[PDB]
RNA sequence: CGCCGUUCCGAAGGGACGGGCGAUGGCCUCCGUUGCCCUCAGCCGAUCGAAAGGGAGUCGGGUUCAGAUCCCCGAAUCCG
RNA sequence: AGUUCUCUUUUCUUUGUGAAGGGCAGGGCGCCCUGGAAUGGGUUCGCCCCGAGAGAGGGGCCCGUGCCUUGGAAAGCGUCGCGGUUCCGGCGGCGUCCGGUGAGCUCUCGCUGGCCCUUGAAAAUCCGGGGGAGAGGGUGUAAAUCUCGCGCCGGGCCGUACCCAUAUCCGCAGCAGGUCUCCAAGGUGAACAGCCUCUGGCAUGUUGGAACAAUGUAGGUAAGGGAAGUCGGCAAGCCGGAUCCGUAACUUCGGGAUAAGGAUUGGCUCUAAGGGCUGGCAGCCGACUUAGAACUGGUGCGGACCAGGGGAAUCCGACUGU
């Protein structure tokens, strides 16, 4: 069938602390399909980026928690995990938020 | 123990009430000699024997 | 893993202290005390080894 | 409650080494 | 607890002199009508919403009716 | 401040050990004046009292090794401490074999690949340790059928 | 002072369906109760002896500084 | 939630449903009906079963602590987010899902067997049956009667905190002693062994600091020799697991026996064999074993832990037990 998930980086991007296009690029070559992260299984996984929302679609089984695994990996590579947090907004999406400090 | 007879639980209650210091106004009594309760008991130092 | 305690003051494994494990709506395992196993009647003939039928045990 | 606050609060307490004798009684000053 | 299958018997239950209150619980799939009698909590499970509304408006008077939320 | 009471109450409210109760070192004065489970519940909700996560005990190492052992690694002569019978009892080996082979005979008889007279003969041979495994029994049945057919043809 | 003995040298039953005579009553109608009589009656051993033996029937959730299968909420069950 | 310099669709946590009632799986039956079986068949790990009725059909009963359901989602829990007096059973969103496997451990139910010159309580209490003394009404507003379903009332007395033991008990004490039980995770491993770890717990056992003499107490190592020491090999030491091979005198033929004596043991990459479900074949599943081979390391591999030294004889007592 189809599986659709979204990442909402609105709060950071509108604060200009992460280029969503770069994040889309990051998921482009890193997302794995049967152990390979090059061709996205041959378009079997499709990525779309909106203004501040990134979407992922798949024609095969895809784990929503994988996007959280990669999102956290990307946040760490960009030294953001100490300020941002990936929290499930709904059954189909995650969003980035700020820890309650000051 | 938790398992207790009424007779034992009543003997123990009386031994509980006698284990207090003397009232301090007893000191001012006219012909008083008592300085303190000399019949104090401690559960660990000396045992009731029953 | 979760470990159990008796719910009564009988701490010994006697014939009247048998239990079974029960998961509860609170999502924990507790002891429920089982009833003894009943026996169906034995035939008055004293010969047939089996017990009778149509009778609650 | 986020579990990351344990770390953030723990690190904040460590900083009291430099303010011995004038440590804040309450950092949630408001109220 | 006892489970009643037909609206006919539930109405008889709700008219018993020892019936105290009727609680209606609305779930995603069914509407449950529970009457607190002396011994048991009788329940009727209705899957049709229209019948549940129809039964709700046809309860006997004087019986405390509660909607659970 | 002396927070022995608060550590004990929070532990009960969180249903954890006292070792997993975390009291905020910056808020000891606030936590100190909470002498009730109602007020502890408030501090738990506020974030001054938090339950610490379980200490990690990862099974990855043993899961990795279990995969290797399934392929035969770490299983040689030098890695055995119990006897061949203690590691794999003979009785269990025999029990599996009889069930496997008796199951096959029942299906061949039911499916009429053999008759009840051949079944009875093979049943007592199976119990006699004539056949090592399923295949040896199956090939032997095949030879028996060929001979039985040849005898029928001439007759 | 007591001891032995526990069914052994004992008139060891104060009970019962039913029936008959009265005395009373009450939803006085007819049913209760009671006293006596008739009839029937083995248990054959007073009593004590187990918080591990026998022995009907309670579980879930919440709650305290300290008690809960005991309190509160909910749902049951045994016995009379 | 942790890690993320590299790698890791990764690692960790967590992912409910009580009693009682109903329904159904499952398990058991020395229960019934048909029928009549040798070319004997059925059948278990073993057994064991049959003309006093086997196989094969069709039934009945008992337990159902398992699953569904009423309970019951309203509760509980996980997470995210809002309020409040803020010491509210506070309020809302989402979730509480789908499968596999096992000589596994713990409990429990059941079947079947072995052992006894051992045969492994009583009573309170409850129930069925046999009998048929009796009672009930004359065709009705029916009666006696009812172990059926509801409904009504009550359940008095005493115990209940906590310790339960390197500090709440007994040893004069917070005494290295003694003192009856229940539950019991991962790894290695034959394992409730030892060694490490999670849950939970603790603060080194009635004190600390600085030194590192002698003599101690407790552990180790030692060239060459190897009991010369000593009353005496006391003490320590050697052996040790497992696989394969091999095993004497004597014997009460059961043993002796792990006799004695050898070889092997790591890591890695493979090969072969050992099954289940569905429709001599095809497909899909799967769980640990055994054997064999190559390669490989400074010959090191039961690498820690665990873990018999052996042989030839004499005396005594048969033995196990005290
Ligand atoms: Mg003492
Ligand atoms: Mg019957
Ligand atoms: Mg054998
Ligand atoms: Mg008595
Ligand atoms: Mg008793
Ligand atoms: Mg008892
Ligand atoms: Mg009650
Ligand atoms: Mg038959
Ligand atoms: Mg259940
Ligand atoms: Mg809920
Ligand atoms: Mg009769
Ligand atoms: Mg207690
Ligand atoms: Mg020390
Ligand atoms: Mg110390
Ligand atoms: Mg001590
Ligand atoms: Mg030397
Ligand atoms: Mg040397
Ligand atoms: Mg010498
Ligand atoms: Mg000398
Ligand atoms: Mg020695
Ligand atoms: Mg010898
Ligand atoms: Mg001897
Ligand atoms: Mg003796
Ligand atoms: Zn009989």
UniProtKB/TrEMBL annotation, chain B:
The function of this protein is: RNA-binding component of the large ribosomal subunit. The ribosome is a large ribonucleoprotein complex responsible for the synthesis of proteins in the cell.
Q: What quaternary arrangement does the UniProt entry report?
A: Component of the large ribosomal subunit. Interacts with IMPACT.
Task: Supply one GO BP term.
Answer: translation
Q: Name one GO molecular function term.
A: structural constituent of ribosome
Got a GO cellular component term for this one? Answer: cytosolic large ribosomal subunit
Query: What keywords are annotated for this sequence in UniProt?
Result: Ribonucleoprotein, Ribosomal protein
Q: Which gene encodes it?
A: LOC100343258
Family in the record: Belongs to the eukaryotic ribosomal protein eL39 family.
Judging by the UniProt lineage, the source's domain of life is Eukaryota
The name this protein goes by in its record: Large ribosomal subunit protein eL39
From TrEMBL, chain D:
Q: Where is this region: Disordered?
A: 1-30
Where it sits in the cell: the answer is:
Membrane; Endoplasmic reticulum membrane
Compositionally biased region (Polar residues): 16-29
Q: What is the top-level taxon of the source organism?
A: Eukaryota
Q: How does it assemble?
A: Interacts with SEC61B, SEC61A1 and the SEC61 complex. Interacts with CANX.
Similarity annotation: Belongs to the RAMP4 family.
What is the role of this chain?
A: Interacts with target proteins during translocation into the lumen of the endoplasmic reticulum. Protects unfolded target proteins against degradation and facilitate correct glycosylation.
According to UniProt, the name of this protein is Stress-associated endoplasmic reticulum protein
Organism, scientific name: Canis lupus familiaris (Dog)
The top of its lineage is: Eukaryota, Metazoa, Chordata, Craniata, Vertebrata
Q: What gene codes for this chain?
A: SERP1
Shown portion of the complete protein runs from 2 to 32 of 66
């Amino acid at each position: 069938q189809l599986l659709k998930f979204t990442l909402d980086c609105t709060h950071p991007v509108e604060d200009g602390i992460m280029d969503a296009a770069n994040f889309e690029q990051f998921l482009q070559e890193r997302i794995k399909v049967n152990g390979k992260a090059g061709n996205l299984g041959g378009g079997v996984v499709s990525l779309e980026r909106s203004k501040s929302k990134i979407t992922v679609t798949s024609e095969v089984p895809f784990s929503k928690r994988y996007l959280k695994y990669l999102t956290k990996k990307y946040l760490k590579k960009n030294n953001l995990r100490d300020w941002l947090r990936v929290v499930a907004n709904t059954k189909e999406s995650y969003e980035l938020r700020y820890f309650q400090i000051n | 123990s938790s398992h207790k007879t009424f007779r034992i639980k009543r003997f123990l209650a009386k031994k509980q009430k006698q284990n207090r210091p003397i009232p301090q106004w007893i000191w001012m009594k006219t012909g008083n000699k008592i300085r303190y309760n000399s019949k104090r008991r401690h559960w660990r130092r000396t045992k009731l024997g029953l | 893993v979760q470990r159990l305690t008796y719910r009564r003051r009988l701490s010994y494994n006697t014939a009247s202290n048998k239990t079974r494990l029960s998961r509860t709506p609170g999502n924990r395992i507790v002891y429920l005390y089982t009833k003894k196993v009943g026996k169906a009647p034995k035939s008055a003939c004293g010969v047939c080894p089996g017990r009778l039928r149509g009778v609650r045990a | 409650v986020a579990k990351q606050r344990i770390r953030m609060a723990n690190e904040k307490h460590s900083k009291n080494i430099t303010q011995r004798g004038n440590v804040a009684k309450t950092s949630r000053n408001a109220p | 607890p006892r489970k009643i299958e037909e609206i006919k018997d539930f109405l008889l239950t709700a008219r018993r002199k020892d019936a105290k209150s009727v609680k209606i619980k609305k779930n995603k799939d069914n509407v449950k009508f529970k009457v607190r009698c002396s011994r048991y909590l009788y329940t009727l499970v209705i899957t049709d919403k229209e019948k549940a509304e129809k039964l709700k408006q046809s309860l006997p008077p004087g019986l405390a009716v509660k909607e659970l939320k | 401040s002396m927070l022995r009471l608060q550590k004990r109450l929070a532990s009960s409210v969180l249903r954890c050990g006292k070792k997993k109760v975390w009291l905020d070192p910056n808020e000891t004065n606030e936590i100190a004046n909470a002498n009730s489970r109602q007020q502890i519940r408030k501090l738990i909700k506020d974030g001054l009292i938090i339950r610490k996560p379980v200490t990690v005990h990862s099974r990855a190492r043993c899961r990795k090794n279990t995969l290797a052992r399934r392929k035969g690694r770490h299983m040689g002569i030098g890695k055995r401490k119990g006897t061949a019978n203690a590691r794999m009892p003979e009785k269990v080996t025999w029990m599996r074999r009889m069930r496997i082979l008796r199951r096959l005979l029942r299906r061949y008889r039911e499916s009429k690949k053999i008759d009840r007279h051949m079944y009875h003969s093979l049943y007592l041979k199976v119990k006699g340790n004539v056949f090592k495994n399923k295949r040896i029994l199956m090939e032997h049945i095949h030879k028996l059928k060929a001979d039985k057919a040849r005898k029928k043809l001439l007759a």
